[PDB]
Design an enzyme around this catalytic site. Sequence first.
Site, PDB file in Angstrom:
ATOM      1  N   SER A  29       0.804  -1.270   0.000  1.00  0.00           N
ATOM      2  CA  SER A  29       0.000   0.000   0.000  1.00  0.00           C
ATOM      3  C   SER A  29       0.826   1.305   0.000  1.00  0.00           C
ATOM      4  CB  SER A  29      -1.040  -0.023   1.127  1.00  0.00           C
ATOM      5  OG  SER A  29      -2.113   0.839   0.822  1.00  0.00           O
ATOM      6  N   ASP A  55     -10.715  -5.154  -2.635  1.00  0.00           N
ATOM      7  CA  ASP A  55      -9.966  -4.229  -1.795  1.00  0.00           C
ATOM      8  C   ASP A  55     -10.768  -2.936  -1.685  1.00  0.00           C
ATOM      9  OD1 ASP A  55      -8.100  -2.285  -0.801  1.00  0.00           O
ATOM     10  OD2 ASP A  55      -6.423  -3.408  -1.714  1.00  0.00           O
ATOM     11  N   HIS A 104      -7.550  -6.085   1.029  1.00  0.00           N
ATOM     12  CA  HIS A 104      -6.334  -5.314   1.339  1.00  0.00           C
ATOM     13  C   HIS A 104      -5.412  -5.949   2.404  1.00  0.00           C
ATOM     14  CE1 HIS A 104      -4.247  -1.502   0.770  1.00  0.00           C
ATOM     15  NE2 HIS A 104      -4.105  -1.388   2.078  1.00  0.00           N
TER      16      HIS A 104
END
Lengths: 278, 278
Positions: free
Chosen positions: A148, A224, A257
């Site tokens: 991320s 996600d 995620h």
Amino acid sequence: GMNIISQNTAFGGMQGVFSHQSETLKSEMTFAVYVPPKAIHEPCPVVWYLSGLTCTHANVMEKGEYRRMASELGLVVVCPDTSPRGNDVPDELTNWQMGKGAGFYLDATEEPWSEHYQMYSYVTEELPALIGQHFRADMSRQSIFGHSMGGHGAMTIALKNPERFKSCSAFAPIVAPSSADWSEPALEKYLGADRAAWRRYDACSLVEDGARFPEFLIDQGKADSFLEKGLRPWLFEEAIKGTDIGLTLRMHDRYDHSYYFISTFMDDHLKWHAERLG
Amino acid sequence: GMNIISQNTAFGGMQGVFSHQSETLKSEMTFAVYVPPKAIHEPCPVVWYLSGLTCTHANVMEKGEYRRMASELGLVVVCPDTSPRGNDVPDELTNWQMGKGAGFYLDATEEPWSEHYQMYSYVTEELPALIGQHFRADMSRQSIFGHSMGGHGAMTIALKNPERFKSCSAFAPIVAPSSADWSEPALEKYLGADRAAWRRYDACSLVEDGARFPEFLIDQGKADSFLEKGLRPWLFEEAIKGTDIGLTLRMHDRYDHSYYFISTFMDDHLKWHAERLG
Ligand SMILES: [Cl-]
Ligand SMILES: [Cl-]
Ligand SMILES: [Cl-]
Ligand SMILES: [Cl-]
Ligand SMILES: [Mg+2]
Ligand SMILES: [Mg+2]
């Protein structure tokens, strides 16, 4: 200069937690290093794993499931923190997207952030010096990846330092933090209202400006929750159109995620790097 | 009657966290269930993993590294908590060896532990009834394993319920809690000063008293700091002499008590059970 917090045997190798006094960050800093069985015979290649918002070294160390394959492939795995830490370090207390756990792998220029928020310098200069000094690491074979904000970190660092890293990959990276909901405010606080300075901290902007890296592996979950507003991997696909940059972008049904997604595809990333590390 | 806390895709399967109102424990209780991809087409065998002192479902769920091999083998993995939970549940606050996170997989008879501390009935009756009700699980094929206090749990439960479980293994089990520093005081508090009542909750005592089960796998790190005072797997070796109980006891150099050890040997345990679950 280094303190040992913990050392535990896992898959024949040694998973350690360490701390040091960072000069670049003016903070006591904690990081993890996994040393594979092979390191006894030879210094081993290093993969740097950069973590996302709110994380420390602990999230991936505990949940990334990297030791089995790192052991098999003879890879040293280094997991830094995500910001400066300590009583003196300023924070935005009621925003998990800013401050502590949220250094965005940049060198802050604005007050009060400038004093401690030097994560770019920390990850690219100070901590690598410390690792080479203290560990059985072949510093001629280093790669970088992350999750991320960490994927943002990994990709921008690779693009800005192509000759230092043999390979780069990411799990759900923020590829265009300059216009992403959770990273735009942070960039403005750390770097200022003038958006020109942001271009060296945006993977897409860097490609636009002529920065190059051989290729990237990017895994992304379709479920996600951050995909549409926060991540937008297609913008990186757009940025690299007409360039020599290779992209292996894989979109995964049902994956989100979390570390459940990361751990699932971890072995693929470790092999990706080991192959390119040489 | 169940609540869904979280669901996350991992290795093609689903790792869930759930809660329910427990009648046996008079507690709101949280547990984890991993459903492998095989459950998309058919009912799957269940492995029950019992955790050790201070743990919740979370420690093994996050760090046990069971999902990759569980997915491959088609195993449902259930991970309960270790004690009743709640703001009015009695405890010894700072004693991590008693009360909360320390139910010792027994049904307590002594006040005030009697009200909530019915972990044996919870794990063997109430929670299996819930699992069979809500998951595509073949309840005819169940196996049980655990770490430490959870190894004590898995082993004592198997010995007392030999027809219910196909196999049993343990990481660093407390094989003789009646004479171990960290368990002897607990047995006395939950069950009374009369050590006769402890015999149903001591693997070695159960064997001495005629309890049988086909075989056990036990993995034990040699560098485990609890080995000599709290674990003593050789005592179970002695107990099974001249009995029909099989034992595969493995002692590993350099390995300690932690999840670094547990995860290293997790695949062996999952294969052990899959083999015997047919
Ligand atoms: Cl992030
Ligand atoms: Cl998500
Ligand atoms: Cl324990
Ligand atoms: Cl230990
Ligand atoms: Mg904050
Ligand atoms: Mg306690």
